[model samples]
Structure formats: C-alpha cells, structure tokens
Target: MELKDIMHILEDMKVGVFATLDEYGNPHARHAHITAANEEGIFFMTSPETHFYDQLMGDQRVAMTAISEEGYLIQVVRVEGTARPVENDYLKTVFADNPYYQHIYKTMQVFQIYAGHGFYHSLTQGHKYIFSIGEVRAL
Candidate 1:
C-alpha cells in the first residue's frame, strides 16, 4: 500500500470514527464526516456548541479510522494526528468544494488533520505490509 491508498480510502469513505480526549483524559468517539482529503491530510467540521468541538479546542490531537472496499477486499485506514484549524483561501476552497458543508458551517471550524504517514497491515488476510503515509505533505 501507499499514501495514496490512505487518501483514496479516506475520500471514498467520507465518514469515520474520530477519537478524542475529554477533560478526564477518557476516550470520546463519534462518527464524523470528513469533508475532504488531500496530500497533507483530511478536513472536517463540528458545531461550536458540541462536545467534539470542545474536545478539539482543548486538545488538537485526534485519531481517525475508516474502511473501504476494493472488489471483495476490505481495507482500513487509521490516522493519528492533530486536527488543526484552517482558514483564508484554502478554507474557502474547502467550503466551495463541499456543498454539503457550505449549506450547513464556520471558518476556523474546519480542521486540516494529519498524522503518522502511518503503516498498513492486514488483519485476517495475512497480506500485512507497512506503508508510510509517505512523502512531504501540507495542511
């Protein structure tokens, strides 16, 4: 697998389980919508009144796990990184590219999240191999 694999799966499967920490350092998770994916990372949004947004504010660190299928094969992508906010032209680009979010959001509320460039391994398929998120990417 390659970084493109991660990108393709993420963009293909726009919804995933995003994990964050609370005040007590407990794991809090939600099925979040990934607005877009790029060379650097993925983008998403949350309402300011929500706990997820509060958690992100408290700590930028986050994790996202998503799965996709290629024919009969299923692949999972796990990303560990920071959900940093985005703004300006790129932020506008995100909103422009995603009509659903555009109809629904906030400027600084959008996050350009990334991590590990990680490694990939198959669970039951026994076709395990390591693939780095790979190369230089941006937010």
Candidate 2:
C-alpha cells in the first residue's frame, strides 16, 4: 500500500496496540494513542513512569497493530519498526495540545517509529499488501 493510503487508515484509527520486549524477551503490549502520522514516521507519547516506557528503553524494536472496520470488513495494519525517543520542543507542543496528558504527566516522551516493514491486510478482499521503508513497491 502507498504511504498516503496507509496514513489515511492510521488517521481514521487513532488507537493501536504497541508491543515491546522486556529484559527476558517477554512481550509487552499496550494501547497507545496516536499523536502524529506523516512521511517522517508514526509518533506517540508516554510518561517515563509507565512500565511500557521502561520496556521501550530496554529494546527499541517494536510492533504495532492498528485496526478499523469498513462496512463488514476488518482492515488491519501491522507496523514493525524501531521506537526511538524524541525529546524536544515538538514533544512538549504535542503534549500541551492534548488535554488528556495535562494533568497526568508533567513531562511526556515522544517516540517515532520508522517504518522498517509493515503490512496492510483487508479481510473482506482477502488481500495482504506488504510495504517497507526505502522501497517503492508493495506486494
């Protein structure tokens, strides 16, 4: 699928399951709210207090699944990427804009996931389109 197409799906679906790994290689999954999506990468935020934050610090490799329904069909996007912490003015700006974070966290950490590889699956159409970073073709 095209970048814009994938982004559109992400825009419609704001919440996703973000998966990370612990020191023992155990899986950790949590629902992450979407902050931004663009050609640069997919971004989300969390507080340092959360266990998920610790897991990401331990291992950058992560996977996410965002899903939405079109009529009767379920559309799912599986994103595999490295979660790098982005701490800057942009992170603060985004946090300020979101009221949900205002009272809970004094500071928020932004994470951007570079699209290492991903797949867009349409259950109704029974088609799975795979895409990757630095590659133009999706198969």
User: What's the true lDDT of residue 84 in model 1?
Assistant: 72
- lDDT value, residue 87 of candidate 1: 65
TM-score of 2: 0.78
TM-scores of all predicted structures: 0.72, 0.78
Instruction: Candidate 2: give the clashing pairs.
Output: none
Candidate 2: C-alpha RMSD after superposition: 4.2
- Number of clashes in every candidate structure? 1, 0
Question: Model 1: runs farther than 4 Å from truth?
Answer: 92-108, 121-139
Model 2 Cα lDDT, one tens digit per residue, 1-139: 4776776677567888999999999998999987766556677888897888999988998999999885677889888988888765545554455765444233788787865788888878887887764242445
Segments in model 2 whose C-alpha atoms lie over 4 Å from true places: 70-73, 89-106, 134-138
Predicted candidate 1: what Cα RMSD to the true structure? 4.9
